[PDB]
Amino acid sequence: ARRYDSRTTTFSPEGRLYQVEYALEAINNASITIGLITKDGVILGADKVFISKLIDKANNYEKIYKIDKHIFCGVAGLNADANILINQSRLYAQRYLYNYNEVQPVSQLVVQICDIKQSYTQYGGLRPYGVSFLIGGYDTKDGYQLYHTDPSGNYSGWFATAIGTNNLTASSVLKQEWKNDMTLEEGLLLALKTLAKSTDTEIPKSEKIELAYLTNKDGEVYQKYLTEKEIEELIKLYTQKY
Amino acid sequence: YDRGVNTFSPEGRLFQVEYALGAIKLGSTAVGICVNDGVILASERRISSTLIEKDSVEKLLSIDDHIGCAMSGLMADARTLIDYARVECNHYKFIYNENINIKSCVELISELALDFSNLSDSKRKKIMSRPFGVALLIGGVDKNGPCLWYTEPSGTNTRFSAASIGSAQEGAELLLQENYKKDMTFEQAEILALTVLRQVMEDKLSTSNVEICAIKKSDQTFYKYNTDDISRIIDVLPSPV
Amino acid sequence: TTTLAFKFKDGIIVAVDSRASMGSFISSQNVEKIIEINKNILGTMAGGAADCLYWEKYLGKIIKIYELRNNEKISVRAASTILSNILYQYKGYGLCCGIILSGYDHTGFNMFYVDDSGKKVEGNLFSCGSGSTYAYSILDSAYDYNLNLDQAVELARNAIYHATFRDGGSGGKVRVFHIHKNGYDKIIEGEDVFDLHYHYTNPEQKDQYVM
Amino acid sequence: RNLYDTDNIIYSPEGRLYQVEYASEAIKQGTCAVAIKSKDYVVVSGLKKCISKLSFPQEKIFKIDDYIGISMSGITSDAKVLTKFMQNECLSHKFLYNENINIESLVRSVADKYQKNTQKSSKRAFGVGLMIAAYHNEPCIFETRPNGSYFEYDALSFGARSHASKTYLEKNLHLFEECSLEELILHCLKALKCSLSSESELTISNTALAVVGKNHPWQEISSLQLEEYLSKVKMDAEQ
Amino acid sequence: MADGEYSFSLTTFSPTGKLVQIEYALNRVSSSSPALGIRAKNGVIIATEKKSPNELIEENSIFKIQQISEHIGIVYAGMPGDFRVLLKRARKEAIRYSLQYGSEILVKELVKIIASIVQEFTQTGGVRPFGLSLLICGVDVYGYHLYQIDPSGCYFNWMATCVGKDYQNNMSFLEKRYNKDIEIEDAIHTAILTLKESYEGVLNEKNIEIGVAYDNKPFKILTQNEIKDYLIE
Amino acid sequence: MDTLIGLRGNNFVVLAADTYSINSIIKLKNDDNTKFYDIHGNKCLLLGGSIGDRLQFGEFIRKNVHLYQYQNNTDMFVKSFAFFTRKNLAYYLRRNPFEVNCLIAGYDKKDGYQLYWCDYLSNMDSVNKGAHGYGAYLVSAILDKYYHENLTVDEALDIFKLCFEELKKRFLLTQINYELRIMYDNKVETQYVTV
Amino acid sequence: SYDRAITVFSPDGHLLQVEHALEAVKKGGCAVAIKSSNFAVLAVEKKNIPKLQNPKTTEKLIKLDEHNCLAFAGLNADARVLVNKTRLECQRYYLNMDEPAPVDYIAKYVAKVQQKFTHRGGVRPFGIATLIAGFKNNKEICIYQTEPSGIYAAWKAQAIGKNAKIVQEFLEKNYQENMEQKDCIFLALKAIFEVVELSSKNVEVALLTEKDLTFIEEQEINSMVELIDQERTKNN
Amino acid sequence: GSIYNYNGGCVLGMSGSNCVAIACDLRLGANTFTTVSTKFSKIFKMNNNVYVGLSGLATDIQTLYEILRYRVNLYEVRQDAEMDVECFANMLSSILYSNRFSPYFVNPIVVGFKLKHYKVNYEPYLTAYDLIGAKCETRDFVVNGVTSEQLFGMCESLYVKDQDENGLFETISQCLLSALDRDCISGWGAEVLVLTPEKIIKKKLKARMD
Ligand SMILES: O=C(NC1CCCC1)[C@@H]1CCCCOc2cccc(c2)C[C@H](N2CCCC2=O)C(=O)N[C@@H](CCN2CCOCC2)C(=O)N1
Numbered sequence A: 001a002r003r004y005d006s007r008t009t010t011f012s013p014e015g016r017l018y019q020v021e022y023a024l025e026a027i028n029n030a031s032i033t034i035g036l037i038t039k040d041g042v043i044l045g046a047d048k049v050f051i052s053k054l055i056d057k058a059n060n061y062e063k064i065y066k067i068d069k070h071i072f073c074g075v076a077g078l079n080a081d082a083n084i085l086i087n088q089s090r091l092y093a094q095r096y097l098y099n100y101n102e103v104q105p106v107s108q109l110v111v112q113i114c115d116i117k118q119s120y121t122q123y124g125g126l127r128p129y130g131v132s133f134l135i136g137g138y139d140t141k142d143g144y145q146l147y148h149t150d151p152s153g154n155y156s157g158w159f160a161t162a163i164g165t166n167n168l169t170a171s172s173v174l175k176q177e178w179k180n181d182m183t184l185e186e187g188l189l190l191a192l193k194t195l196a197k198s199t200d201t202e203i204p205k206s207e208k209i210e211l212a213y214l215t216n217k218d219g220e221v222y223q224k225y226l227t228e229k230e231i232e233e234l235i236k237l238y239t240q241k242y
Numbered sequence B: 001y002d003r004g005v006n007t008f009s010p011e012g013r014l015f016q017v018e019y020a021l022g023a024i025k026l027g028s029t030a031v032g033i034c035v036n037d038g039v040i041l042a043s044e045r046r047i048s049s050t051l052i053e054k055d056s057v058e059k060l061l062s063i064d065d066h067i068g069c070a071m072s073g074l075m076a077d078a079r080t081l082i083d084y085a086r087v088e089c090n091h092y093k094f095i096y097n098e099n100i101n102i103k104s105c106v107e108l109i110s111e112l113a114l115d116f117s118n119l120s121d122s123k124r125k126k127i128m129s130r131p132f133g134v135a136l137l138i139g140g141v142d143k144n145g146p147c148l149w150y151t152e153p154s155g156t157n158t159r160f161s162a163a164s165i166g167s168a169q170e171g172a173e174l175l176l177q178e179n180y181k182k183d184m185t186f187e188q189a190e191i192l193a194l195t196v197l198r199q200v201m202e203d204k205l206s207t208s209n210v211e212i213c214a215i216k217k218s219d220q221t222f223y224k225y226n227t228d229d230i231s232r233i234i235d236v237l238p239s240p241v
Numbered sequence C: 001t002t003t004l005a006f007k008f009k010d011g012i013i014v015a016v017d018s019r020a021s022m023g024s025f026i027s028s029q030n031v032e033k034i035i036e037i038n039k040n041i042l043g044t045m046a047g048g049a050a051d052c053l054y055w056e057k058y059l060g061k062i063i064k065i066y067e068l069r070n071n072e073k074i075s076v077r078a079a080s081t082i083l084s085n086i087l088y089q090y091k092g093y094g095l096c097c098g099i100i101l102s103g104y105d106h107t108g109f110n111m112f113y114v115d116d117s118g119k120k121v122e123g124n125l126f127s128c129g130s131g132s133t134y135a136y137s138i139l140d141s142a143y144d145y146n147l148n149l150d151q152a153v154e155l156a157r158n159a160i161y162h163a164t165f166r167d168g169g170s171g172g173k174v175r176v177f178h179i180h181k182n183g184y185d186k187i188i189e190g191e192d193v194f195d196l197h198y199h200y201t202n203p204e205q206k207d208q209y210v211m
Numbered sequence D: 001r002n003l004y005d006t007d008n009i010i011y012s013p014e015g016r017l018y019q020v021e022y023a024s025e026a027i028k029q030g031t032c033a034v035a036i037k038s039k040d041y042v043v044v045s046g047l048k049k050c051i052s053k054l055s056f057p058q059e060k061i062f063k064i065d066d067y068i069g070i071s072m073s074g075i076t077s078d079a080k081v082l083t084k085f086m087q088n089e090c091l092s093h094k095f096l097y098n099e100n101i102n103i104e105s106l107v108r109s110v111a112d113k114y115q116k117n118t119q120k121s122s123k124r125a126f127g128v129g130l131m132i133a134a135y136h137n138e139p140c141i142f143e144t145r146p147n148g149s150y151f152e153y154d155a156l157s158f159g160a161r162s163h164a165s166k167t168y169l170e171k172n173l174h175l176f177e178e179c180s181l182e183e184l185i186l187h188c189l190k191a192l193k194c195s196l197s198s199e200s201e202l203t204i205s206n207t208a209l210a211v212v213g214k215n216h217p218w219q220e221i222s223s224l225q226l227e228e229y230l231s232k233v234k235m236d237a238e239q
Numbered sequence E: 001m002a003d004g005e006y007s008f009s010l011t012t013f014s015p016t017g018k019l020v021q022i023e024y025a026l027n028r029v030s031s032s033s034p035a036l037g038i039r040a041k042n043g044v045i046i047a048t049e050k051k052s053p054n055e056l057i058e059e060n061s062i063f064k065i066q067q068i069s070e071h072i073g074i075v076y077a078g079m080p081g082d083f084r085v086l087l088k089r090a091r092k093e094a095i096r097y098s099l100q101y102g103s104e105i106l107v108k109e110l111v112k113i114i115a116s117i118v119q120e121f122t123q124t125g126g127v128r129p130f131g132l133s134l135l136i137c138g139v140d141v142y143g144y145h146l147y148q149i150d151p152s153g154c155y156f157n158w159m160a161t162c163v164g165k166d167y168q169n170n171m172s173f174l175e176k177r178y179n180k181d182i183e184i185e186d187a188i189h190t191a192i193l194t195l196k197e198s199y200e201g202v203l204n205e206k207n208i209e210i211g212v213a214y215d216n217k218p219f220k221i222l223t224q225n226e227i228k229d230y231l232i233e
Numbered sequence F: 001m002d003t004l005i006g007l008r009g010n011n012f013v014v015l016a017a018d019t020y021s022i023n024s025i026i027k028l029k030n031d032d033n034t035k036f037y038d039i040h041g042n043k044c045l046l047l048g049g050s051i052g053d054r055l056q057f058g059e060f061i062r063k064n065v066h067l068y069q070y071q072n073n074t075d076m077f078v079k080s081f082a083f084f085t086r087k088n089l090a091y092y093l094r095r096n097p098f099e100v101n102c103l104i105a106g107y108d109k110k111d112g113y114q115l116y117w118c119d120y121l122s123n124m125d126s127v128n129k130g131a132h133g134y135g136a137y138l139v140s141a142i143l144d145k146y147y148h149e150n151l152t153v154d155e156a157l158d159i160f161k162l163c164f165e166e167l168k169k170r171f172l173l174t175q176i177n178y179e180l181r182i183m184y185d186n187k188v189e190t191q192y193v194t195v
Numbered sequence G: 001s002y003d004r005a006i007t008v009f010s011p012d013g014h015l016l017q018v019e020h021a022l023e024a025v026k027k028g029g030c031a032v033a034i035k036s037s038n039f040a041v042l043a044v045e046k047k048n049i050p051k052l053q054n055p056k057t058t059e060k061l062i063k064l065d066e067h068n069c070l071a072f073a074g075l076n077a078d079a080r081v082l083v084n085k086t087r088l089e090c091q092r093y094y095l096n097m098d099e100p101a102p103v104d105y106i107a108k109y110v111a112k113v114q115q116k117f118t119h120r121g122g123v124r125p126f127g128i129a130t131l132i133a134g135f136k137n138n139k140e141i142c143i144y145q146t147e148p149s150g151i152y153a154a155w156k157a158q159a160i161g162k163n164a165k166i167v168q169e170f171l172e173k174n175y176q177e178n179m180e181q182k183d184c185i186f187l188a189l190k191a192i193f194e195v196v197e198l199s200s201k202n203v204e205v206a207l208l209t210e211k212d213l214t215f216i217e218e219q220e221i222n223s224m225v226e227l228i229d230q231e232r233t234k235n236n
Numbered sequence H: 001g002s003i004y005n006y007n008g009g010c011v012l013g014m015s016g017s018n019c020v021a022i023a024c025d026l027r028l029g030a031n032t033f034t035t036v037s038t039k040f041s042k043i044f045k046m047n048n049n050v051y052v053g054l055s056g057l058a059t060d061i062q063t064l065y066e067i068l069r070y071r072v073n074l075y076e077v078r079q080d081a082e083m084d085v086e087c088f089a090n091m092l093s094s095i096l097y098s099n100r101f102s103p104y105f106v107n108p109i110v111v112g113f114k115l116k117h118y119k120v121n122y123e124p125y126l127t128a129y130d131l132i133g134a135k136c137e138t139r140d141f142v143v144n145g146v147t148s149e150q151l152f153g154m155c156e157s158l159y160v161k162d163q164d165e166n167g168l169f170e171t172i173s174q175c176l177l178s179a180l181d182r183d184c185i186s187g188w189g190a191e192v193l194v195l196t197p198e199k200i201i202k203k204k205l206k207a208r209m210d
């Protein structure tokens, strides 16, 4: 039966892990997911992949997910693998709350999920998870945070970043336009700009945009998942400003 | 690769064991000499640079008070085997209140080395997934007097009066065969060991690139050689012609 | 049983009696209640004979393995921690162990008391066994850190003697070992307390002493 | 490429298990051993492999129990695992039943240990053969193979160039039954010598010899007795 | 076997990043008898093509539309044995939820649990993916739902959809005549018309199964006579 | 019995204990050091009960909290530390209980100076003042009577001195040797008191 | 549970998985550790996208316990898992001995873990090499270097990761004993910049003493970088 | 039995018209007679429509509250909605029974609103439990704790159907205070939470402190 083993967790002649490279190719083939930090909160935006006009576009976010009250993620890659890992990370946040009676710092949650991914790359004979996460949140220790994870269990903090297809264009737009002290509105307009420019267009379309942000206001951390109407308002504002 | 670890070749040899045999041919050369008054182990150290601390690296480890060991091949595997031997020798000493015979230590080491074969589930289960790729010289003094034993990845243990391991195994063995004598005294054993090492060492013999230990029959205590002892030996060496 | 140890200016004195009992019957008067854990650490046995012997020899094995593996001498504190953890793992099982670990290491002279309940107490003067209150009273009454070796040995002997005099569980011989920087010496291998009584309390030997 | 000799659980189109056959092939590479028996005695003789001039000869025969000993050919570590198993089975039988184990039952247990290592892809066959000599109501010699089969013999030999010893044994098989212990020892030693290399001899160093019989617990022969026997063999070989 | 060294993934990544086993399961689904579901104003309908191979087979013995609990129904396109296993698991999870929380399992929760079960079989060692797609319809406090579950374990929220044979053309036919404000009768007629346009020949009360959940009522599988009435027009 | 006392003010928290190590009817030591468990990051666990259980539970808590702080390169919040301690004690309560009473103190910017009172059953609450042991019966009313918010550190130490005098005078075990941990102004100080 | 032997002997007698892990290590950033009388300096290359990536998040130079630190080269995720195992072992040692773990003990433990991961079915080796600076039980400062095969040694100064040969040869002819803290920091900066672009933001530097681990400030690094640029231009 | 006397404490739930109230004493006892705390609330907010009152052994109170918070948070993040009060009540019953033979020594009550979504109607919801999860759904009042008999007498005598928020507050506060005044091991303060669909009013009563 060894003749059927594909040897997923085996080093390649160049110290590379081929399954991880292929999972990264799959992630690079997914729709764009962006994130950026303002002084008013973390913004996550995403392009929706069209399937049919019959999909139920009401209260159906499929690329941005709530992990906890103070944490939320964007997904790039295989959606079912992402669903598994999102369930796991929700469990991890609640476990930290159970054990310590306080909400989990964002970096600790990112570390736990990235450990899951690394373990799949090192132990066993199973394929890795084909998902990259943009995890953003707030906690008193480190303020507003934004992280990027890849299948290898790697991660890193960012002030703005993009994953998925054509992340180069979106990243260049963010590098040119992201500033160190932006307001929520400015952040949302910049997110709309980078989404529009990565999708090869000029005016973005509400039907294809998921936008959410996470603010710590008056002491409560609160997450807003913009509807098609709010996104339409922002699209009008963007077409005014450009 | 294509094969499994436990595969026989058409000539009835385990492929993995044979490949492991090709790994023991590497590393610094060590020589063991066992005469009636005590066993002596000598080894060259291949210091890689001036930045490496000589104290850290060492090819002559003590397994028990009365047992020393020289090693060759993969050093991490050798250290694993040596740690296991230390634990087992001390367990024997605890449950029997006496020093373990050297041959018994060699047997324990050889069984640990062959654990990868998965031949039987008795006592612990299989954990090692491959041979160790290590050859050892284990000398010591037990109730039967001094003795020098050799173990290798195939699990065969052989007793010698003098032996050699490492890169210059063959030249050192040639020098030992034609010079060793059974009635040699200890000082002559030291002279022979350092002469052989100097003859086969790429570098020039000196107190810093040679390590020595001996288990004398008088006290059955493994003893490491400091600089004065090595200098004393080096002085009485013959000419390098 | 009476064991004791104390620090003084030249090191550590360790003294014990040598009686072993099965109930009220004296099983032996030549048992050895000081056990060399290693070249620089001595252990004393109080309580269950099998428990003390087994777990102190087991500690000796552990320490031998440690000192081979790490090419250095273990500390008395580490040895006591290992022993206390091992014993605590048997809590509720009914082990009877009263142990004093004394030795020299790179932090100087050290002394710990370890019992089966997991207790681990650093200190400079300990006593264990049925006779330990008597040894304590004698030592505290006449203890000075600046005693010389002869005075320290004499005090240890006298304390053991008084313990064996008042305690039916202690007797036989007094052994007084001296721990110093380069190991330990047996100052008094074993001296019958019989002579000690007619030396200290009733030297006249002309009538029965009256408590 | 055979395409059928890679795994130990795969039959070839001819119905053969190649990995097990290779394990057997390992047996032919070992040093020669000879076992023969009279009506009261079994004598085992074998050549002790010597690695080099400064090396001590390898051990060829081993005591299992008071009246049981073995010789092996093949992978030494395998033989050691089997030796430990047999010694433990015998001692455990004495411990439980206060009697010496039945030799047939022990050999069957050994053969079942052999067999169990041939049915799973995660195992390999023991690459060693065991020659077993005991006295249990009668002298007996057994052989065990890597495939899990065992056989009883009246005279037996295996190892490198054991066909010459087998020729000698077949020739004189009729004699062994009625010959004395001294004669039986001479026969075993001569059969072993028949397997020697051209330049080699039989010396106290390189020759292992054990006897076991009716009132004769398994016992290796001492250097003095061994030397006298070897001298007698040489002298009556000159004839 | 199921443990030890013999537990390695049979679905692995290709150089382009695709998991071809999932694609092949998808092809297997796309070759199966069509199924579809429609979310109407006050109910949700799931309908399927059940073409009897021979006059000997008993139609009632084969139901491609099953009830998971009160108010939740399920239909599949693909391999029937896989469907049986997943239907048993879905019923088990419904009752597990019901035992914990007393009330009936919310459709979304069931769909997520089943999708995770499906996903496991694309990653765990020694197995193939499930070769089917599921349509799960139901009614709960939060309205009417129609969900699809793919062999990969992804799930989609639909107003109306079709899986199985030539589902692109069926999808165009269904999207040409679906509004969010249809009624139960209009939805059933639309489902029947879609299946007719797909099925080659003439449909009947024996060639189709239909299941409804409407007006806050328990899930119901239309009998032969009810479908016959729907087919009279 | 081991007497433990804790008092938190707006600007400080003070813990205090007797310094006796007891083996049956004799004092092994008059300067016990197995009660206070200083924890990196302005935290302190004070324990009473059997010495063996004290050592085991306290060193376990200290090591786990240090591990957390090294792994996450940050200081654990005092409240998180208190509830981690309580939860571990409650885990072992129904399996192999640690018969230990705890006072948990610390400072952090989020909550200021905090004091938690936890008993051997892992009943815990945050308090302004608390005590454990039989001497709690004799110090609790003094704590109540003389405590007020805005108390200064010197005033709190005078309150503790009142408590120590009462323990020496009226408690069956005449405790006269004490050790105090004072946390205030971003520094932890140790004091020893004889009455 | 997967149990296949991933690391096996090639016909040549090599553990090819170990050499591939070594390749991974050679793909990592450079790290340098220099020893002194009672302190060590550790430096490591930094890679960070300007104005978008956060520099404070990625940590190649980390603290194991009270007195031991670690730098590593190779796969970051492997490094994180190994580092967390090492911190756990540090605390376990403290619990079992009532003393903090010495540096040599921790180096031996890390090497044991790596060797073990070359010798167990169903796992691949760690693709990391590590530099471990800390104090022995005699309070002496030591630096150990471990590798994916599990072999370790103590060094007066060592570099790991990409282009480590150039840094090693540079350190051989420039390292002295008992250098002052300023000069040791400068030597570490020169060693790291022998193979990495000259810039303050391309290197992170820390200093290890008995007290604690202290990272050298940005302005100090920039001043030392200007000194290096001046010496380079003047040498050309 | 005596385990429940170790700490003391009690909880009380009451409903009015479009309002519901939950009240508890504030004492943390020890050894049945020593008061160690006077701010130990037995009332916990699961979500805006679900409160739980936990009397009994304080360690078990805290442990069970943490378990319930974990479960509710997981359920609500997965579902993206607030947990219905009845689902929560059944879940609490199942959690308590899962420890049927080594139970948590707790005497819970659940108080909140059952939402009937048409506009939304808010129906008061009350349930009292035993330690193994047996449930008592009620419309007027629920009680639990060592003070149960006194609370039962006060409620049976004083409860008035369909009271507005102020009448509800006065009634539940009087019931709690009168019951507490007859208990040696309960009291030392009372917190009263009066719930409406629009606001929550939290009050601390000037109660007896002996
Ligand atoms: O003197 C003693 N301690 C001193 C002497 C050395 C160290 C200090 C103790 C004094 C009482 C110890 C109580 O804790 C126990 C723990 C476990 C078991 C038992 C007792 C019961 C056991 N019993 C009772 C009758 C049958 C039997 O097995 C038993 O009392 N054993 C004797 C051993 C006496 N000798 C045995 C051989 O020779 C050396 C010593 C024994 O432990 N005495």
Ligand SMILES: O=C(NC1CCCC1)[C@@H]1CCCCOc2cccc(c2)C[C@H](N2CCCC2=O)C(=O)N[C@@H](CCN2CCOCC2)C(=O)N1
Pocket: A095, A098, A099, F087, F090, F091, F092, F094, H063, H066, H067, H070
């Ligand atoms: O973080 C955890 N798991 C990590 C540790 C390993 C990997 C992950 C979970 C957290 C899950 C939270 C869900 O809510 C509960 C579910 C079931 C039971 C209980 C609570 C109550 C139970 N209680 C409360 C006090 C007495 C007792 O038994 C209890 O807390 N169980 C602990 C296990 C504790 N041990 C686990 C290993 O570590 C040492 C301690 C437990 O479930 N932890």
